[PDB]
Amino acid sequence: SKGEELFTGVVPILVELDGDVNGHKFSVRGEGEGDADNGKLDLKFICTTGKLPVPWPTLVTTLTYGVQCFSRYPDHMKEHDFFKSAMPEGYVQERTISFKDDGTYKTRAEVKFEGDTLVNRIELKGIDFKEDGNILGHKLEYNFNSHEVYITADDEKNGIKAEFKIRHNVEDGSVQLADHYQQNTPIGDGPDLLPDEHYLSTQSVLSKDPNEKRDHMVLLEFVTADGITEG
Amino acid sequence: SKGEELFTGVVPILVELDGDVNGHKFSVRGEGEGDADNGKLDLKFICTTGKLPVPWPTLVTTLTYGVQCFSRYPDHMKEHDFFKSAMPEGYVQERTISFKDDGTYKTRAEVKFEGDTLVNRIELKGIDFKEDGNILGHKLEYNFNSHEVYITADDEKNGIKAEFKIRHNVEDGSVQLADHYQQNTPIGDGPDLLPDEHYLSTQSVLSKDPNEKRDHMVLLEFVTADGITEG
Amino acid sequence: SKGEELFTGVVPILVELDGDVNGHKFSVRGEGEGDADNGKLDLKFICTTGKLPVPWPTLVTTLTYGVQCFSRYPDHMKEHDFFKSAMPEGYVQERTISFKDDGTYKTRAEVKFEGDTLVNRIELKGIDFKEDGNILGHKLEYNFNSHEVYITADDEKNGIKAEFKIRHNVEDGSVQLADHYQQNTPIGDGPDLLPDEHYLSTQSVLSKDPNEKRDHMVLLEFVTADGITEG
Amino acid sequence: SKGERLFRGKVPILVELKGDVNGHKFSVRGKGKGDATNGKLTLKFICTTGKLPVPWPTLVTTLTWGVQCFARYPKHMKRHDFFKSAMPKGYVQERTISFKKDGTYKTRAEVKFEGRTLVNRIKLKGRDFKEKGNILGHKLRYNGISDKVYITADKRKNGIKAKFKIRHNVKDGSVQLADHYQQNTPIGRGPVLLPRNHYLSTRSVLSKDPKEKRDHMVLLEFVTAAGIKHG
Amino acid sequence: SKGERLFRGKVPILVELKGDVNGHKFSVRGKGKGDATNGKLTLKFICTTGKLPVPWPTLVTTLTWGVQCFARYPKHMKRHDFFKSAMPKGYVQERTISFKKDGTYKTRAEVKFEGRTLVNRIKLKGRDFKEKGNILGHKLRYNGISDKVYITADKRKNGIKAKFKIRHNVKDGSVQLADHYQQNTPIGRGPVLLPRNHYLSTRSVLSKDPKEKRDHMVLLEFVTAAGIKHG
Amino acid sequence: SKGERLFRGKVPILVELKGDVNGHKFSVRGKGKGDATNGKLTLKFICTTGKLPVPWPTLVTTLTWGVQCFARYPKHMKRHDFFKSAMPKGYVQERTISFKKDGTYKTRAEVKFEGRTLVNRIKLKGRDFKEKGNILGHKLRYNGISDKVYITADKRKNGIKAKFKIRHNVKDGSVQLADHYQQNTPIGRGPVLLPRNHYLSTRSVLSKDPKEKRDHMVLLEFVTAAGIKHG
Amino acid sequence: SKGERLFRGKVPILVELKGDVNGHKFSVRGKGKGDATNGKLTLKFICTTGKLPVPWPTLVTTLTWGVQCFARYPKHMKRHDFFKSAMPKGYVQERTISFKKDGTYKTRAEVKFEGRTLVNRIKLKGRDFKEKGNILGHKLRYNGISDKVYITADKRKNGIKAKFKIRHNVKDGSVQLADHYQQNTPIGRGPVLLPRNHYLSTRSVLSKDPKEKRDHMVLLEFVTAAGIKHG
Known about the structure:
The structure is cut from a larger assembly and holds 3 copies of chain A and 4 copies of chain D. Chain A has one helix at residues 82-85; strands at 11-21, 24-35, 40-47, 91-94, 97-99, 104-106, 108-114, 117-123, 125-127, 147-153, 160-169, 175-186, 198-207, 216-226. Chain A is mainly beta. Chain A has one domain (1-231): Beta Barrel (Green Fluorescent Protein), CATH 2.40.155. Chain A is globular. Chain A starts with 10 loop residues before the first strand and ends in a 5-residue tail after the last strand. Chain D is mainly beta. Chain D has one domain: Green fluorescent protein (Green Fluorescent Protein, Beta Barrel). Chain D has helices at 60-63, 82-85; strands at 11-21, 24-35, 40-47, 91-99, 104-114, 117-127, 145-154, 159-169, 175-186, 198-207, 216-226. Chain D has an 11-stranded mixed β-barrel with strand order 1-2-3-11-10-7-8-9-4-5-6. In chain D, β2 (24-35) and β3 form a beta hairpin. The C-F interface holds C 153, 155-156, 158, 192-194, 196, 231 and F 96, 98, 104, 152, 163-165, 179, 181, 196-197. It is classed as luminescent protein.
């Protein structure tokens, strides 16, 4: 009945997005594989409708960052895992990404299993952006920093939530701030009981593929968790 | 779903027997209470059909020794417990008690819950006894020693078994030997998986009641378990 | 006066058997050498009357397993040794090997010294076997497992006894069970006093000889003892 | 400490609850005594405002599972005791009882001495209960209640937090669940004992009084602890 | 040790089974390679005697869950490894696969090197299967398999023993269970590593080959360990 | 402890034996005092049923070698004392006195306080004595008795066990031996001292009273201990 | 050390004795080889001056029990070895063989290397032998010899001393004893190993050669050690 053993070894991943940013419509498709015993994660995105309106580091927290089930939890916290335990039924992840001095994103993803592969299906909507801003002007560097996500329980709706700040790098030297607010909720029967407060620690390495002519992105991300001492 | 928490504090006990020893028919009824957190056990028997053919220490291993669910297991072995985990459905306990140089017993008990009390229902049959023996001649002392029961798994029938030797004291100084061979089997769904080999260690204090005119027996028994080291 | 020093180094061994299994008469002769300082033992059997009715692993517990005087006792138990201390007078070893769902063996051996060599003389009788069984159908594999023998005192007849179960491997995957019950008794003056309860731990490697045309068996067995802690 | 000595001998118990479930208000007064040496409670409850909108088994964890200063801690811990150490000042207990596929209770309480009578004062407020459900439809059976209370320490608020779930029996043969998330915090300000990851083996038995007319409930609770291997 | 170095790089695998279920005999031959650095197996099985009386998912724990020397033990244990340390001599693995409300398998196996090809040789024998059941009626779905293998040490037989249960999916929506009790024992006689209470997170994925005609099965297994907090 | 203080000063001794040797019954009553500070006993025995079928030196180990709570333990041990620590509750002592080339005694006893008089109550039963032997033929000399009592601990039965042999002098110049195997077990249930492998240097001197007419014996025993090198 | 490496493989042995017993002079020359890995000696002795005044079993402790550098010390001591550590310089061995109710031998010897052949050079001188005794009357049987050699250390003379007794068999059925008191002292001056209270389990087997004419003796000796519980 436990979903913890479904993430042993290497799991196929499929990511799909439907975007709407000031009326600009696009779609991003990603495929790869994930290793939940080390937190090791590797996948590759393409933009199937030509060009991309928003920069690629703004979509890192939405594409391969809603699949948080590939987080390496240590052995003293394997029971405090909302994400692996809500499987193979899955969960729903809704955000509100608040850009500093600019507009916002509205995402809604439904991570679940479809057969053997782990399917992320995001529907993104973003309004109120500024022309010649840091986002629509493509003024962000092609890198993503190392961050921390404080996950806490949200008992009164049968789910969890998290609040954190994403610092994007700007071409001229300044820093673009993004404020995240996610709300998870399982599809049917979730875990046994909701976990204690603990923090995920992420690292990511953005790169490219020299043998591609489409607007693409190659990602390599390493997620572990801590925040609970020895008990 | 676990039956381990049903034995917290003090549980009412009811014991019933139907005997047949060389055609002599009798019945023993017992009531009391049990404390499964210390192994502490206390109950009182009466013989509702007048006199008793066999001695009272021969029926100690059959009356309050098939209710082994009141055994104090230590905290490092609470998952290796066949008896508390087969509750509240119960189990079936069948023996063949082989007396040295004499006949034998054939018991069959069905320990279970009936509401809130823990009901033992034994049906005993004993044949091939010897006249002027240690049993039918009432030549056994009114005491019971401290013994050990080696419980092992019996996978191929979904149950456990145990083999041990009971040393009865005789009036003149010799020792009467009894060889036990029990086979447990749960009623419906038993435990998760059958336990490892471990030994129960019993002590009992036989006594009387000065305010009784019926052929009776007062028992106080202390059962713990060991045999599995730190893991 | 002590017989412990008679087993230093390498001792010549001679084993002789006279069998009677459902009227089939045979004889097994064995020769080799034994090293009682390591438990190391090595000897070779031949069947001097042609073929053998029973399988060879059924006779391992009777041929080189009544000579238990080659057991490596550790230095903290050299005084708890019934077998080396009953030498050079010897002892008598009688068994009743109970096969599961089949008949039985009745052995009687007289292990002693004859000059310098250590002579085992077994007279075996076996009845009540089943045709097309695991024994007379030759359905047992040619291997012998690692077992334990619980030796205890038997004061009231000036000797010891042991009870253990031998698990034979069957050709199809099942397990044939043999129940042993031996009774030792010295010839004249035995040891000083009978030992405490301790267990022998055996290992054996069954093999063959490529340069033999007679129905034979080559055995290599390693016996140590434990069961008594530091005192 | 000086708080454990207050619990020797029988101590009277006063329990006062002021509830508000889905607009429907009620009040429950309880009285009785509590043994802390054995871990035994005997209370009798009455519904002062007539009928009751929720079933009696759902309020058991609010009334008498809040007086957890009457826990039988064994001889070998006596240091992992938050509940007795917060006395005679008291402590504040808040829960969040989240029913599966139904609404949620929100409780707060103050368990503290008033001279000698241990007085519990509960404010309860429930919401989001669907009509014609199990709880508002009185589809719950009138059975007892028993599980473990996994207690862990919380250094920040100078208190503890526990986390467990409860299986209620339904008249239709199904099981109604109840996730319990609680927090204890002392009233102040004397330093208390902070435990290390133990639990409370607890059972409560519900029955009625055949001499009453008002909507009532008679309760018998057994509390003990485990989970620490000091010995 | 000297046994771990034999598993670097891809090693071929030969698997030979000779089964006998309820009178119906069969044989299964398997071949392929196995990565021990990542804990990954790729085998292909064929039924040499035509049809198969038992479902393919029931034999997965016998064929490829017996080659457990291909386990990815992490960097921080490397000492709790019985499976690689018993090499190149090998080890003997025996199970008792007891189905709920149905009969039982009895297996023995020998996993050892033959030069370079790791050869597994299984003898299987099942009995007590009721006709028109889930297993003999082929009422099991063709899905994968995944659970944990709780491995504990056994000092007496110089080996280990593991104990786990398996949930098979049924076409009628129910779950067919399978209790596994196994024992490992080395062939001899070089001293090996005795672990301390770890487990094996394991998943196997079943699929078919669209180019075959015989009754076949393609298997992909992922093995890793956990349970020890060295770090 | 609280048991050692009961033995300061002279304590009276009552000894009652009810024997049955080879059909011939007898009874022996003894009385006197015992010094525990020096390890000295002075008793006088009388045969209440006239003559005696066994010699007086054979019953010395049953009567006064059973009151071993009067042992002079030195200043530097005072912790390896099972005999005084089982007081005032008492202990149960059972022996098996096996004569060479003759039968065996079977004794049980209860050494415990009755207010202030230390009362020993022996039941004895012997068998297998050949007629016209040393014992039944009264061929034993009337000499004293002295050897060591090698005491070792037994953790299982919460008692000790001792093991020694006794050399009786014969009128024909030969030596009649007597192997003694004893077991002590407390009546219960206060925890006692478990020793570590000491012994009792003991001598008893037999003499007669020239003022008596009945068959009698006057005894003078000296008990002390050694075997532990604390200093 | 550098002395143990000299004893790997078979080493030849030369033994030369010049005796003088009660005026009667003799000489014995011996030759052969000695295995130090197994603790095995094979020597052949001849009496160069014709007949021999003392029996051959009395001279066994002088000839071949003096070459004690060929002792099988086990793997777990290798530090309590005086005999191999005094090599290649050698050591001086002196005994005092005192017969019961008879005279005494006085021996000295030098066991040291001469290039590669280990040469033993014994001077012997006996006195006080009564005429027509066991030794001078040749009343000793021609049997072997075996006992333990209790070796203890001597710090003052930078050597060891051993002390043991030997039981020789007599033709009249009696036993002739032989008390052995020996002293070892190295020739000098390299510091050696001083042991701690071990002993030598030793057996020698005597036989004859059917191809000789002179008074001769063929010897086969087995030497091993024990007494230290390092493990």
